[PDB]
Amino acid sequence: EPEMHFDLSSEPWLPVRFRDGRRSEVSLRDIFVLAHTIVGFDVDFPTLEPALLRLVLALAYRILRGPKDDAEWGRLWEADRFSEDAIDDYFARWRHRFDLFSKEFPFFQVADLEPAGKGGVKTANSLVAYAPSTELALSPAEAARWLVERHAFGSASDKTGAKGNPKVKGGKDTPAIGYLAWIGFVAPVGQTLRETLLLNLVPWQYRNLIRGGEDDVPAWERDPLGPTRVMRAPDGVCDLFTWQGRRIRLFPERRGDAIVVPRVLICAGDEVDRRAARDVDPHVGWRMESRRGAEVSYVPLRARPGQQVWRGLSSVLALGAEEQRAGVLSFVEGLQSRGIALVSLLVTSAKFGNMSTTLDDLAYDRLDTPLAVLNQEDPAAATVAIDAVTFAAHAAQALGYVAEARYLSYDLSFHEESKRHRVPEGKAALAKAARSALAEEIYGRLDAPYRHFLTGLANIDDLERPRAEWAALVEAVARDLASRELAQLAPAQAFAGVAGEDRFRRMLARARNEFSP
């Protein structure tokens, strides 16, 4: 029987969108050679994009042998494409490590991996992630994409014990969630994939932003792994970006002329030392959680699921005293003199339930952000952007007085007209849920206007004008919603509409004076 092979450097498996509109899969060689002709990744599931971007960045540092510094970065930015000769010299040296079905060095796999007991091998559908809320074999390209994703985004369900792992007890060895599932990921995206890769290729000289260097090598340059695992500090970004967080083996099968993957074994792998990750990783911001003398703990800053990403703009910009922005944003902040006005910030975060076994929520978004808003030297642009979010939040809160009007009482046991107009205790939880629903409705209406406002800050000198424009837009949206809700009141709730509208209008006026005097 002929040998099964699938060389990831020369076979198509990375879905991209081309500048001429084509949508197709490319090999790792073509994703570099054609990076200046590609818009970007065109993936099918949100966790795939950070995982595949970080894989491709680890490969870029190794192919380019840099950038070590600003001068090297500058010569890459000023060039129009990546060197085919650099790319082909690298893949000629390492393509014996890019075969998905190699019998000795299967890519991101353990060649001899076996279950510790009976039933550990599962159908290949277990490698596929599904939305936060079975016999289909995978193609080699699908399996490769999910393999890259699973090492980074796996859950504590990947507990199947591996033979030869002496940590196995009760037939299992339970891992932590994957490292990308743990961090709040943020990365800039340019107009082409080549720009995106360069915006993320922080030079090694930025020791405050990343750890990288000549000795920092990715997983496929290291000795292949076995069933044993460790907790280890990453050597740098190439190591971290290709972290073998799991121990996986694909079981391919020939079906006529097609190679497919019907089965897989997924076990616990290496854990990232979270203290060392903070020094290495440019795609995560941090908040200081506790300090006891010299002992300090940090937690990742996280895009909150269930809200539009600009509502958490202060968690992106990390402007509080206990917060530190993603090192990639500090790098991009210094690139205005290169002709870059805006970047699209890709944000992802995850939330798990049931002792880290189930993916309960996934935050995934893109925000078009001016480099002017990233400016910490002159903070006026960031200040108007954050203040505009605060004004939206105050308008949503003011609308609560109208949302609750249908539940308001006129209670004669109180002796002040303001205290008589109240929600009775038996309707408090319902009125609170109605206030939240009307707040969510105004945020949905302010989404496309906020994004337009934020993009417009890129080319404005006098920031008092967009501050006044945003104030009038939010008021107009808030009064339209208030008028619709008041018109729906039953006749016996007319008094509640009068009180509610007055409270809404006074609160809105107070917030308006604080935002745009």
Automatic annotation (TrEMBL):
Superkingdom of source: Bacteria
Name of this protein: CRISPR-associated protein, Cse1 family
Source organism per UniProt: Acidimicrobium ferrooxidans (strain DSM 10331 / JCM 15462 / NBRC 103882 / ICP)
Any Pfam family hit: CRISPR_Cse1
